[PDB]
Amino acid sequence: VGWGGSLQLVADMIKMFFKEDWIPKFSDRVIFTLAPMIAFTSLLLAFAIVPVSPGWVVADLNIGILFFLMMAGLAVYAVLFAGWSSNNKYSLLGAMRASAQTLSYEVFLGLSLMGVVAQAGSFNMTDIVNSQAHVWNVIPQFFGFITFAIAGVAVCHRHPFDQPEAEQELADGYHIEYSGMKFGLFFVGEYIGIVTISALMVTLFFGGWQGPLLPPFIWFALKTAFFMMMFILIRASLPRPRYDQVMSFGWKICLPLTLINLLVTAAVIL
Amino acid sequence: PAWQTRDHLDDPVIGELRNRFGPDAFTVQATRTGVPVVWIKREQLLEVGDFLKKLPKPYVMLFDLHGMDERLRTHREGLPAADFSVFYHLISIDRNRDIMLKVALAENDLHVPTFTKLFPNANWYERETWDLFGITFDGHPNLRRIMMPQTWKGHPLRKDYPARATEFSPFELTKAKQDLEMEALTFKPEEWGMKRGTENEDFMFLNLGPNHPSAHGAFRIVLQLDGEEIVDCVPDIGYHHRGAEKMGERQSWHSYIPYTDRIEYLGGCVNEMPYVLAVEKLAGITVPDRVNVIRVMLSELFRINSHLLYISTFIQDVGAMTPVFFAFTDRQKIYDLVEAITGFRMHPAWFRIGGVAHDLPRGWDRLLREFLDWMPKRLASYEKAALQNTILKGRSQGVAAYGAKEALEWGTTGAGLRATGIDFDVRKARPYSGYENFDFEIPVGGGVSDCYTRVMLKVEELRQSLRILEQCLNNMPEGPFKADHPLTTPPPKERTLQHIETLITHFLQVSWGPVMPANESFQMIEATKGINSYYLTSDGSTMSYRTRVRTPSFAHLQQIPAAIRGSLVSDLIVYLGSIDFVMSDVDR
Amino acid sequence: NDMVNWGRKNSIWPYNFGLSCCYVEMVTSFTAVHLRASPRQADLMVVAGTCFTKMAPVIQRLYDQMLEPKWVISMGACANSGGMYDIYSVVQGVDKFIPVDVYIPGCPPRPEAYMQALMLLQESIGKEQGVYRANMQSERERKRGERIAVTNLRTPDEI
Amino acid sequence: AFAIFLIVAIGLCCLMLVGGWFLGARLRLSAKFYLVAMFFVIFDVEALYLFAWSTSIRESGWVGFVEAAIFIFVLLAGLVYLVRIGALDWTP
Ligand code: SF4
């Protein structure tokens, strides 16, 4: 039997290849093609700002944080042009409610990231990875860390669980009208999304490239693997939350939490 | 005996109707239904029913309305000359009595005034009579075909209609292309019921056919929407029609028993109990006490399983499904006991006329005792998890509620009707299968029937069923598992393997069938959902002449349009989940 | 190389079309083996339950919607044939109007039968419909000498 | 650099898409109530000032914390206003 966890996803990709493509009638054609890469390329290029090595850095640009927020905001357009390209009021309203809770729960990550970039004081990722040299920026900011966790898992990572189905009748999940390679493109996109959120979390919250007794790149890789397993553990443990309860625990509870979080970090940093 | 042929002429209702109308018109039939069967010409039916409706203790609920062919009955002594008949079974709860009314019709003039004005739940019943027979009910609002498609020529319950598919042309897809063209051109002519609203921007037509889980079968409910309101909901039923009633005519009394198990997939031996009780009423068989206790044990086990499925699914759809999935493991244990007794997990087909198929295997008591001691702690964990929860409780209050009168007019029985203040169980009012030797209580909801009240009552009934099952474990008596009577089918097998006369009885009983003399029997039981009954008529042969299966889910699904009018689509879906309806039961 | 064949054996997407009855055992199997199954995304359709003349166009539209590589598992006697319901209102098998690949007798079949259905279907999927001049061997013929050699069974008066 | 990685990514996109091709009126009550998203459109603009703020706070000091507290207090007053009037509530 197959011994590797990734080989199942590999076979899934093989399966999506060589499948006949049908044209949709009474549909727009340019967005039907362009909507997959708005979901894929965003979290693909979210990987372009990680300091995997000082000598093998993929991009030595001055700002990486703002690019990450730009991808966070950009992701919504994939659910919107997918909703309009569904060309069925059912599916369109399903994607409208999915984009609703998406825009609703994407607010928190930037304000949660303000704490770590304020105690770091720079946008160049070399400064952040050199800041976590002895003390990581997770001990004081527990609330900011969990708020960024909720926000990162809330951006189309399936934790809300309103993507392929709809609690509300008169509408339907928006993953139905795509059946060619685009559905595999969606899955591989969320896969690079979860691994890139984990990598950004480890290299921005915890200390990357430390190397206590072993070479630091495999130290980063193993820590990323532990956070991968913990993310999968809590994603599976996380039950489906209906639309209402998600709206209830959104703007009410965590906007004050992040505002007092910014107050606490600004009071303690000086 | 409880099987002897009675006329019931002495019953007070018969004498009140005799006083009111004097002599003539009424012919009191002799049957083993247990109820008074009266013939009433079709020109006085509406008058007669009205008198019964307003009588000082009225017959508030129309239990059943259907027709009989009656053309091929050779033994017709005492009945008037009829080519067709329509029977109306009515029940007075305050009298705890029943009455059956039979209107005779001739083959050239199949016309009778509609009865829906008195009882609204008769509307679908009359539609079924138009569909399966060819009686036209003049004055019916929407007299269309409710079971077969709208182009189906022929009335399938007539005896000149060949029953089996083999007599028709096989699925050559000549008609599949026409059904494809019809389905592709899905348009609304506004003939699907009243459809007062016009098809424009003001009103939106939505099939809203739930194929998702917890739908309890795939069905369509065409809905007219205005302001996200249910202007008119029209179910399109009949997709799961299996022709069980027609199947009863071409099968022997013994070989039909498997077909009973599939009227309701979750019922199992509950569905078999009324059939065997009616057949033994035709045979005149009194079973031993051990047969009664065994049947009570299997029926309470299946009732517990069905109630646990209803609770689990209810908590899953409108609540937290993490803990109640442990009931799935518990349901497996109830199943390992059923296949320990009967043999197979679902559709046991284990009940026989006069007894059961085998004796209990010798290790049944220890398994049942281990399940009965282990279960109560879990049952109390579910009781705390469901009585004390707040989120679904707040959600599940006042959601499409109805009262006693509303349930009565809509024929609704079971947990729906018990949620109101009417204390009416059939296991106490009309004891059957030895329930009168057991101690159990009937929980009641008060005066408001909603989704929380129904589940709380089902939990209380499940606790009383567990008390019945412990009384079955502690008071199971000793003796035979089959009655001693020549119509007990089959005979005890060890007797068959050694004795020539028992071998001959077994030979003719399993091959030609047992010969039941020409008479009519009727039994109703409390089922897992509502009240389920079987009205069997034998013409003296080894097969049924007429088999009528009254399923409560048909009435429960008929009731939704009266209560859901003035609600949202979400309230509709929640109500559909709450109501105890299964498509197999609605379409038999 | 046959890497493409390996891709389809390793991973399959099931579309559960179980009807009124016969689906409680299928659910028993599915909740142990496995919201992922979606219309117009699956390549496997496990038709269960009694196929009726009235709702057969629904099954034909769902069959048409799926992609070019189509697999169908019939489970139960009610889906393989008409089963016990040889009546005017039931079509005598889902194989009358859609091609079927695997037949799983029973009423209802067991979850282990579903497991053996996936094993026989990956076996057919790994030989390329999958005849390949290897499928003439039949389960009636393969385990015949296994089944005939059985002599003693437990007496039915015990648990 | 970033340009090389972008060229690699767009070349991979062209390779996958080309390979894929070779392989072969009235809404009434429905929708509406996007005003949570309009609240986001305005609140992202409010939080962009904190986006510019987060780079330089050590040289800002006590008056900086004071008027940042005033700013987020104004935002909090607006938020509780929208909550208490019923604008920010359950939404379809
Ligand atoms: S195979 Fe058995 S369980 Fe399935 S539908 Fe047919 S009779 Fe019911």
CA B223/CA B199 separation, integer angstroms: 12
Sorted by sequence, the CB contacts under 8 Å of residue C28 that are 6+ apart come out as B328, B332, C111
Sorted by sequence, the CB contacts under 8 Å of residue C132 that are 6+ apart come out as none
CA B67/CA B103 separation, integer angstroms: 9
B300 occurs within a structural domain = yes
Q: Which residues line ligand 1 (CB under 6 A)?
A: B 262; C 21-22, 49-50, 76-78, 83, 107-108
Burial category of D77 from C-beta neighbours within 10 Å (exposed 0-12, middle 13-18, buried 19 and up): exposed
Burial category of B177 from C-beta neighbours within 10 Å (exposed 0-12, middle 13-18, buried 19 and up): exposed
Annotated binding site of C for [4Fe-4S] cluster: 21-22, 78, 107
CA D12/CA D3 separation, integer angstroms: 14
**Secondary element (H or E) of residue B99:** strand B97-105
B148 occurs within a structural domain = no
Burial category of C31 from C-beta neighbours within 10 Å (exposed 0-12, middle 13-18, buried 19 and up): exposed
CATH of the domain at B548: 1.10.645.10
Cα dist from B243 to B126, B175, B250, B357, C89, whole Å: 18, 20, 11, 26, 7
Residues B343, B461, single domain; the answer is yes
Gap from A117 CA to chain B (nearest CA, Å): 39
Backbone angles phi and psi of D9, in degrees to 5: -65, -45
Helices A181-204 and A142-154, axial angle in degrees (round to 10): 170
Check: CB of residue B301 under 8 Å from CB of residue B333: no
Chain D partners within 8 Å of A39 (Cβ):
none
Q: CA quadruple C17, C20, C26, C28: dihedral positive or negative? A: positive
Enter the tokens of residue B105.
């019709």
Distance C8 CA to ligand 1 centre (A): 30
- Give the closest residue (by CA) to ligand 1 atom 4: C22
Enter the tokens of residue D80.
């509780």
Q: Render A144-208 in DSSP notation, one character per residue.
A: HHHHHHHHHHHTTSSSS--SS--SSTT---SSSS--SHHHHHHHHHHHHHHHHHHHHHHHHTS--
Backbone angles phi and psi of B330, in degrees to 5: -65, -35
Q: Is the bond preceding B235 in cis, omega lying within 30 degrees of 0? A: no
B152 occurs within a structural domain = no
Burial category of B54 from C-beta neighbours within 10 Å (exposed 0-12, middle 13-18, buried 19 and up): exposed
Check: CB of residue B266 under 8 Å from CB of residue B553: no
Gap from B255 CA to chain A (nearest CA, Å): 45
The structure's method of determination equals cryo-EM
Expressed in Å, this structure's resolution amounts to 3.3
Q: Which letter, b or e, does each residue of C5-14 get, where b requires 16 or more Cβ atoms within 10 Å of its Cβ?
A: ebbbbbbbbb
Residues B249, B133, single domain; the answer is no
Q: Do A169 and B569 touch (CB under 8 A)?
A: yes
Helices B364-387 and B326-341, axial angle in degrees (round to 10): 150
Q: Residue B422 belongs to what domain range?
A: 244-587
Q: Do A169 and B321 touch (CB under 8 A)?
A: no
Backbone angles phi and psi of B311, in degrees to 5: -65, -50
CA A225/CA B520 separation, integer angstroms: 74
Check: CB of residue B384 under 8 Å from CB of residue B393: no
CA A77/CA A70 separation, integer angstroms: 12
Ligand 1 pocket mutation pick from C28, C46, C50 by most atoms within 8 angstroms of CB: C50
Distance C83 CA to ligand 1 centre (A): 8
CA A108/CA A67 separation, integer angstroms: 16
Q: What residue in B sits closest to A239 (Cα-Cα)?
A: B322
- Largest interatomic CA distance in chain C: 56
* Residue whose entry in the numeric block shows the structure tokens 């079974």: B89
Q: Where are the alpha helices (DSSP H) in D2-92?
A: 2-23, 35-53, 62-85
Determine the 3-state secondary structure of B70 from DSSP.
coil
- Count how many Cα atoms sit within 13 Å of the Cα of residue A210 in the half-sphere of its side chain: 18
CA B537/CA B76 separation, integer angstroms: 12
Residues B414, B561, single domain; the answer is yes
Chain C partners within 8 Å of B262 (Cβ):
21, 84
CATH of the domain at D53: 1.20.58.1610
Closest ligand 1 atom to C49 CA: 5
Chain C partners within 8 Å of A176 (Cβ):
38-41
Q: What residue in A sits closest to B223 (Cα-Cα)?
A: A170
Give how many domains chain B has, as a whole number: 2
| Torsion on CA atoms D49, D54, D55, D61, rounded to nearest 10 | 100
Q: Render B242-273 in DSSP notation, one character per residue.
A: --HHHHHTTSBTTTTHHHHTTSSTTTTHHHHH
Distance B295 CA to ligand 1 centre (A): 24
Give how many domains chain D has, as a whole number: 1
Enter the tokens of residue B536.
């069997």
Domains (range + CATH), chain C: 1-149 (3.40.50.12280)
Q: Do A103 and D55 touch (CB under 8 A)?
A: no
CATH of the domain at B95: 3.30.460.80
CA C94/CA C74 separation, integer angstroms: 8
B2 occurs within a structural domain = no
* Residue whose entry in the numeric block shows the structure tokens 């083996």: C33
- Give the closest residue (by CA) to ligand 1 atom 6: C78
A244: how many CB neighbours lie within 10 A of its CB?
A: 13
Q: Read off the DSSP letter of residue B534.
A: E
Enter the tokens of residue D29.
């009550």
- Which residue out of A9, A13, A15, A178 would a mutagenesis test of the C interface target, given it has the greatest number of C Cβ atoms within 10 Å? A15
Closest ligand 1 atom to C83 CA: 6
A14 touches chain C (CB under 8 A): yes
Chain B residues in contact with chain D using a Cβ-Cβ cutoff of 8 Å: 201, 204, 227-228
What is the phi-psi region of residue B212: left when phi exceeds 0, alpha when psi lies from -120 to 50, beta otherwise?
A: beta
D51 touches chain A (CB under 8 A): yes
For the range A25-33, what are the long-range contacts, defined as Cβ-Cβ under 8 Å and sequence gap of 24 or more?
A26/A87, A27/A85, A27/A87, A28/A84, A28/A85, A28/A87, A31/A81, A31/A84, A31/A85, A32/A85, A33/D17
C30 touches chain B (CB under 8 A): no
CA B394/CA C121 separation, integer angstroms: 48
Sorted by sequence, the CB contacts under 8 Å of residue B535 that are 6+ apart come out as B33, B64, B87, B89, B278, B520, B521, B522, B546, B547, B548, B550
The candidate with the shortest Cα–Cα distance to B412, out of B209, B568, B563, B272, is: B563
CA D88/CA A248 separation, integer angstroms: 10
- Give the closest residue (by CA) to ligand 1 atom 2: C107
Q: Residue D76 belongs to what domain range?
A: 1-91
Subunits next to C (3 or more Cβ pairs <8 Å) are A, B
The candidate with the shortest Cα–Cα distance to B343, out of B365, B330, B361, B367, is: B361
Chain A partners within 8 Å of B395 (Cβ):
none
Domain boundary among B119, B138, B157: B138
B167 occurs within a structural domain = no
Residues B107, B252, single domain; the answer is no
Q: ∠ CA(B154), CA(B585), CA(B161), 5° rounding? A: 20
B492 occurs within a structural domain = yes
B255 occurs within a structural domain = yes
Q: ∠ CA(D33), CA(D34), CA(D36), 5° rounding? A: 105
Domain boundary among B93, B109, B138: B138
